[PDB]
Amino acid sequence: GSRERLVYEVRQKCRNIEDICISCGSLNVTLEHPLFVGGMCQNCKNCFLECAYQYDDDGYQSYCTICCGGREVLMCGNNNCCRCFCVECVDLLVGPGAAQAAIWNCYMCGHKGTYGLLRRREDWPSRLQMFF
x-marked contacts with Zn ion along 90-119 as a string, rule CB under 5 A: ----------------x-xx----------
DSSP track, 64-125 = -TTTS--SSEEE---TTT--EEEHHHHHHHT-TTHHHHH----TTTSS--EETTEEB-TTHH
> Judged by CB, which is closer to Zn ion: 14, or 29?
29
x-marked contacts with Zn ion along 30-69 as a string, rule CB under 5 A: -----------x--x-------------------x-xx--
Q: Does residue 89 bind Zn ion (CB under 5 A)?
A: yes
Q: Please state, in angstroms and rounded to a whole number, the distance separating the CA atoms of residues 125 and 108.
A: 10
Q: Which residues bind Zn ion (CB under 5 A)?
A: 21, 23-24, 26, 41, 44, 64, 66-67, 70, 76, 78, 81, 83, 86, 89, 106, 108-109
